[PDB]
Amino acid sequence: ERIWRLQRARTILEFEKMLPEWLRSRFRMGELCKVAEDDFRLCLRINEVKWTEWKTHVSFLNEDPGPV
Amino acid sequence: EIVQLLMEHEQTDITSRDSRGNNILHALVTVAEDFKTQNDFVKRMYDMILLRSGNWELETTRNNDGLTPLQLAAKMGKAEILKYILSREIKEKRLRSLSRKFTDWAYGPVSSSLYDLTNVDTTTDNSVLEITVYNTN
Amino acid sequence: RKKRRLKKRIFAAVSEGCVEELVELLVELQELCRRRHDEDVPDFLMHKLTASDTGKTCLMKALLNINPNTKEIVRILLAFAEENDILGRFINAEYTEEAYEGQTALNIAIERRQGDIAALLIAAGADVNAHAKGAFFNPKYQHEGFYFGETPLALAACTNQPEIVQLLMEHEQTDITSRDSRGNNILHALVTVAEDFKTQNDFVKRMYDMILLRSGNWELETTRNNDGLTPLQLAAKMGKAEILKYILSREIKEKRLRSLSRKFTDWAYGPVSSSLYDLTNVDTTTDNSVLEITVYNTNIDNRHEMLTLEPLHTLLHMKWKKFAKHMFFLSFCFYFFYNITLTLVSYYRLLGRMFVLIWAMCISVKEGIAIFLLSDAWFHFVFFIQAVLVILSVFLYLFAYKEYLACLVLAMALGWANMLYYTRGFQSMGMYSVMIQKVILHDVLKFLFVYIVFLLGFGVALASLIEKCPKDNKDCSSYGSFSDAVLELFKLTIGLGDLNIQQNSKYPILFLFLLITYVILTFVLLLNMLIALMGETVENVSKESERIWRLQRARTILEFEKMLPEWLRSRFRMGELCKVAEDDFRLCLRINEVKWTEWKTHVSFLNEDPGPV
What we know:
This is part of a larger assembly, with three copies of chain A. Chain A has helices at 2-18, 21-27; strands at residues 31-35, 39-49. By secondary structure, the first copy, chain A, is of the alpha+beta class. In chain A, strands 1-2 form a two-stranded antiparallel ribbon. Chains in contact: A-B, A-C, B-C. Chain C: Residues 398-402, 466-477, 504-506 are extracellular.
């Protein structure tokens, strides 16, 4: 498993390096998003669930949990 | 306790790079052998030192090899420290900037974590990803 | 200009909540501006107080933006709304958005871990049956949304907030039996959430119990969703186990609610205890019983833990001990004599032919019906192909053709590959056939495909070298034909061939080296097939095979039960009528159990005398 996934990722990066710049720019993995203190940077969204821990979510970027 | 004492003094220089050029963070990354050995205390000191200095300077600098502490933990076989760095959620509203892992919304147990990709994506000269993948050491 | 900035500063000070005195002076200025309007004053007050874009209110913007000083802000806002008599129009408001439709301050506070605020709101006249109907609350793919039955009570129960649940049950305004847009009451919703104990720590079960204790009625579990399923059937259709183990086995101490239970002890003289379950919606008498829902659906991949439960397992075992064993033996005998007469015919080429022609139609129709209903069903398709080929062979036999025999003989082969099916009855032969199936599905196809690849790749070259003409001598230039070379390679891999350096060739050296490399590669590929087998051989094989065995045996049992008529089914009805409580006579299943560890004075028992009869 460790060899298979590793070789797969290596070849993925190989294919990505075979490309030119403008196509890569077009793809643009990740979304630009705003972070506090008037900052804007790349980010990656991942939806996850946690049943074991419950708490008041004081630290949240958006009030409305809507995807858009 | 001694680290607190040292950081409280104004004469102290947290940003002091050694002859090799490494910061405190590079040094700590040169030490995180594994959990079964250390019991994961170096991570605590990393966190405490970052919280003592609310800036990006330490993580931004480079050694004489020309690598960030992140790129260094990727260069070495250092995982726990990297797992910590790439996933930081600080509740402190003032020091929220330093965090890389952000919660966009949490209606309930479902929540969208918003990780960061400044120097992690392949856009940079040497990303964390290429470093991890292109080294058999 | 001034009004828009005013509204923005209102909502911003709410989001920050730096000082309640700011909000006091600000709402005072709002009340002072309220005097300007003479008619339709409260509506404009709300509009200036409400974000008409999304249908959001300042109280919601507050509850979303939690801070320690929030209670005072909410008290101020509610006292203001009461002073102006807009408390009802203010609390019950919700969004106009397509996804956030129906969301209220109560569902917000309950989405948070704050209950005191919810109590304050309910005391102020808050709606408790607020149905939040939206794409967010009614999503697909379990991504970008969260489903909980669309009620505050269900939200609190799913999120482990039992105090708020007790509160919402205490109010007479509450509607426990309130069905949602999907038709699911709170029980169905809880059943939609109980992923696994390792993930939840089994709190949903406790809330199920508490809720049923709060409502001493069969009303809820009798309900049906838009799909038409009781919450029991809902848990069964899903991959939910612990909740089902709770439901199917309930022993209640409260003599008043003793009727709600489904498990009962009718006598226990000591360690012995003859436990007594129920079979209302479990036996096959119902339209879609729990048993069918468990057995037929492969969408779960958890049916082992499901069927290992006591009542279902005992029902299956008893139904096999009564009739299904005999029915399986009987079908086996039929197919035995069928194929034997088929062999007698095919060897010597009237009564046996007639018997075969009569018995083939039943198999054909049953296979067609099964396919219309339809790697568990492979056997049905195989039997269907067999019967089709047999009928084609006989039809050809009537005509003056010669190909008929071919189809016939093929069926024979397939027929003798189908007897393996009946071997699945025996437990040893059961795991035997299941190992056959699993291995042929997982490991063998890889070997066969890649070996065909190598066959082609090397046989093309062998034929190419053998292109040297033998001067019209097939014996001289062996490996001449491509298929001939592949056949020689096959004989070699089996070892029947008679290898020898062929003078009819330009290069014996390269020929020999290539042949040796081929043999080495074939051996190594076979060896890797063996290795990939042994890798999973130990752990997964036994458990998976036994699970599949039990599963398919239950499937067969249910099939044969469906084959029977109404009256024979009525005769073989497992279970017995029993008086449970308060003139209640229901069906039950008996299990005599023994426990030497847990000692207790047996208080609750149906029958005083422990006699079996």
